[PDB]
Design a protein around this ligand. Structure first.
Ligand code: PAR
Ligand code: PAR
Ligand code: K
Ligand code: K
Ligand code: K
Ligand code: MG
Ligand code: MG
Ligand code: MG
Ligand code: MG
Ligand code: MG
Ligand code: MG
Ligand code: MG
Ligand code: MG
Ligand code: MG
Ligand code: MG
Ligand code: MG
Ligand code: MG
Ligand code: MG
Ligand code: MG
Ligand code: MG
Ligand code: MG
Ligand code: MG
Ligand code: MG
Ligand code: MG
Ligand code: MG
Ligand code: MG
Ligand code: MG
Ligand code: MG
Ligand code: MG
Ligand code: MG
Ligand code: MG
Ligand code: MG
Ligand code: MG
Ligand code: MG
Ligand code: MG
Ligand code: MG
Ligand code: MG
Ligand code: MG
Ligand code: MG
Ligand code: MG
Ligand code: MG
Ligand code: MG
Ligand code: MG
Ligand code: MG
Ligand code: MG
Ligand code: MG
Ligand code: MG
Ligand code: MG
Ligand code: MG
Ligand code: MG
Ligand code: MG
Ligand code: MG
Ligand code: MG
Ligand code: MG
Ligand code: MG
Ligand code: MG
Ligand code: MG
Lengths: 88, 101, 119, 73
RNA sequence: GUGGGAGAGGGUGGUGGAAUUCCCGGAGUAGCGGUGAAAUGCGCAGAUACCGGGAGGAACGCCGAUGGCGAAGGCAGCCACCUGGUCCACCCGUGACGCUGAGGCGCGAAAGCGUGGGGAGCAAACCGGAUUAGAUACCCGGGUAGUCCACGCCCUAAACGAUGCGCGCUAGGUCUCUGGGUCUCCUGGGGGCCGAAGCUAACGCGUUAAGCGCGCCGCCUGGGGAGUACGGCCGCAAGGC
């Protein structure tokens, strides 16, 4: 699964400041961690669709958040993408 | 790293030698798969509710252990190899749920 | 010719026929009877009376081997089950006990259309 | 309506998740090897649902019967 | 975010017992089976009934419910691994980041199709026995595809609550599943029943709305012809839209 120490690692990694659990960057990061975990789960077990729905929903959420950031502060957006390495 | 419980039922007819050998292979395989042993309870021979391997009784072993999750299945397999071992059941340990308390 | 003198009595009952198998304590049979052994041929084998005659016949055949006390084992739900029981109860045989062993699956096999609306 | 006894009230302090304890679980099994209904056990939904799984666990180990022969009749 | 919770939610591996069929051994004898009644069928190469051993395939009794989970189809022996959804408490974080959603994409019971495997029970077609005026049926004895597994197709349905999704507002009573709490009781999420106002052609619905409202999508426009014809797209085909 995803252990609390990993979660805290990435949270503290992407936090805008000390004590920030809720920012867009944090959310997108966490979502990305989950997405990668799930996809590596779905390279095997390709016949499990119910989880694939979950993958779709998470992907969608991330895309919406990233879109929001793209609107508000394109700098933080490009930075986020760069550190995460999304968009391909 | 999770905490499990290993139930093993083996042949009640075993003399002390063969028994010792089986337990030796059990401990061996355990250390091979890296299971720390928290405690052990040896209940010995008890009378089964239905015949298993044509024998009316069975010898019981109970090991509360802690091991890496990933290999648990891979462990159980090995424990089933020995002809003398007729039952293996591994359970994720759980906090006791009391009733009529 | 054995002289067993104690044994088991199996009663297999169905809506069609009732047949009785008397065995030694190991389960190996001695004699047996049925609605077909008596002169009944068709549906009359399902009769309670048929079952009575059958049970009594097997019992009398078991007297020939000199048996006294038996254990009764009941399999199947059909007519003339309890009638075969009552028959054996005093045939001259002592009935030590009665048990219903009727096999019930844990739902392994698909029943015939006749028995369906079940599994 | 099972007015004889409730298995819970006929019992003391015990652990439901413990599959190795026979002398209690046996009380929850019928004359046949069957798991008793809520009417007989007097348990609750959660409790019964745990009891079931522990009973089955015990069955697999060989501590409890899957089925039994019915005496009398 | 942190901390707790319940679950037949899903995928992979392993595993347990009951039963059926087949095989092997013992014992045992004249029938078993089946029906309204029978016959075909099986049985002296020893069947049915009984005990013991073995092989295989399929489905999981009791728990079990008017219960639970899932978006729908649908999901039920047990264990382990991987994994989705969801609820409560704390008021911690971001700061309108939301709702819907033509097209697209994916999922989609059963039957059916392709390749390989498997095949115990059941069983379209088919072969028989009965019934009948006939019986291309109901009843009975057999039985192939299929039902089961892997991979790839098919895209249908009484795919049903015959009730699109989301949010707000409008008496309560009662049963229940699952949390929290000052644990008679209060508070929150889900599943049922009876009912205020109101609605409805009526039946009925009624905080799980079919009431009062707003946003967005899909759809209807008398019956037959007809889900047919043509065209187009999709499909190996059957056929689908
Ligand atoms: N289908 C798995 C089932 O898991 C059961 O146990 C399940 C639940 O008891 C347990 O709940 C966990 C737990 O950490 C706690 N109660 C809260 C947590 N949010 C839950 O985790 C949940 O969310 C995550 C995603 O965030 C999922 O990956 C996970 O599957 C889900 N259970 O997670 C387990 C896995 O889902 C039983 N083992 C058995 O019924 C069965 O194996
Ligand atoms: N109970 C095992 C299950 O196996 C599933 O997949 C397994 C089964 O679907 C499939 O069938 C196997 C068969 O390959 C092999 N040649 C024989 C074996 N006895 C079967 O396994 C299973 O068959 C059916 C289920 O289809 C069950 O009725 C039976 O109890 C079980 N033994 O074989 C697969 C493994 O090779 C899933 N992993 C999961 O549902 C579960 O673990
Ligand atoms: K004949
Ligand atoms: K239900
Ligand atoms: K009215
Ligand atoms: Mg959405
Ligand atoms: Mg072994
Ligand atoms: Mg008959
Ligand atoms: Mg599950
Ligand atoms: Mg068997
Ligand atoms: Mg033979
Ligand atoms: Mg036949
Ligand atoms: Mg035949
Ligand atoms: Mg012949
Ligand atoms: Mg002949
Ligand atoms: Mg001859
Ligand atoms: Mg022959
Ligand atoms: Mg037979
Ligand atoms: Mg056998
Ligand atoms: Mg075979
Ligand atoms: Mg039930
Ligand atoms: Mg539901
Ligand atoms: Mg349904
Ligand atoms: Mg605040
Ligand atoms: Mg602020
Ligand atoms: Mg949507
Ligand atoms: Mg669409
Ligand atoms: Mg389909
Ligand atoms: Mg199919
Ligand atoms: Mg096929
Ligand atoms: Mg084939
Ligand atoms: Mg058949
Ligand atoms: Mg037929
Ligand atoms: Mg015909
Ligand atoms: Mg006529
Ligand atoms: Mg073919
Ligand atoms: Mg319906
Ligand atoms: Mg509904
Ligand atoms: Mg409803
Ligand atoms: Mg209509
Ligand atoms: Mg609705
Ligand atoms: Mg819609
Ligand atoms: Mg939504
Ligand atoms: Mg409610
Ligand atoms: Mg429901
Ligand atoms: Mg009403
Ligand atoms: Mg009114
Ligand atoms: Mg009225
Ligand atoms: Mg509403
Ligand atoms: Mg239309
Ligand atoms: Mg017209
Ligand atoms: Mg039309
Ligand atoms: Mg059509
Ligand atoms: Mg045209
Ligand atoms: Mg055309
Ligand atoms: Mg074409
Ligand atoms: Mg056609």
């Amino acid at each position: 699964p995803i252990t609390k120490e990993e979660k805290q690692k990435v949270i503290q990694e992407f936090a805008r400041f000390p004590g920030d659990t809720g920012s867009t960057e944090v959310q997108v990061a966490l979502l990305t961690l989950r997405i990668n975990r799930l996809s590596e789960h779905l390279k095997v077990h390709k016949k499990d669709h119910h989880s694939h729905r979950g993958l779709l929903m998470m992907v969608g959420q991330r895309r919406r958040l990233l879109r929001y950031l793209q609107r508000e502060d394109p700098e933080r957006y490009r930075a986020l993408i760069e550190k995460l390495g999304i968009r391909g | 790293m999770r905490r499990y419980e290993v139930n093993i039922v083996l042949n009640p007819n075993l003399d002390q030698s063969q028994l010792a050998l089986e337990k030796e292979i059990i401990q061996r395989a355990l250390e091979n798969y890296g299971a720390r042993v928290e405690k052990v309870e040896e209940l010995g021979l008890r009378r089964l509710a239905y015949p298993i391997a044509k024998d009316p009784q069975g010898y019981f072993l109970w090991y509360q252990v802690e091991m890496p999750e990933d290999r648990v299945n891979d462990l159980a397999r090995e424990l089933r190899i020995r002809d003398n071992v007729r039952r293996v059941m591994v359970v994720k340990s759980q906090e006791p749920f009391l009733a009529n308390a | 010719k054995r002289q067993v003198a104690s044994g088991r009595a199996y009663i297999h009952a169905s809506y069609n026929n009732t047949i009785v198998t008397i065995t030694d304590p190991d389960g190996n049979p001695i004699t047996w009877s049925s609605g077909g052994v008596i002169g009944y041929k068709g549906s009359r084998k399902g009769t309670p009376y048929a079952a009575q005659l059958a049970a009594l016949d097997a019992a009398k055949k078991a007297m020939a081997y000199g048996m006294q006390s038996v254990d009764v084992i009941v399999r199947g739900t059909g007519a003339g089950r309890e009638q075969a029981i009552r028959a054996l109860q005093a045939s001259g045989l002592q009935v030590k006990s009665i048990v219903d062993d009727t096999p019930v699956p844990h739902n392994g096999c698909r029943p015939k259309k006749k028995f369906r609306k079940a599994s | 309506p099972s007015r004889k006894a409730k298995v819970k009230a006929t019992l003391g302090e015990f652990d439901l998740r413990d599959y190795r304890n026979v002398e209690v679980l046996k009380r929850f099994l019928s004359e046949t090897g069957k798991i008793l209904p809520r009417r007989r056990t007097g348990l609750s939904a959660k409790e019964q649902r745990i009891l079931a799984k522990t009973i089955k666990r015990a069955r697999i180990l060989g501590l409890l019967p899957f089925t039994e022969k019915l005496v009398r009749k």
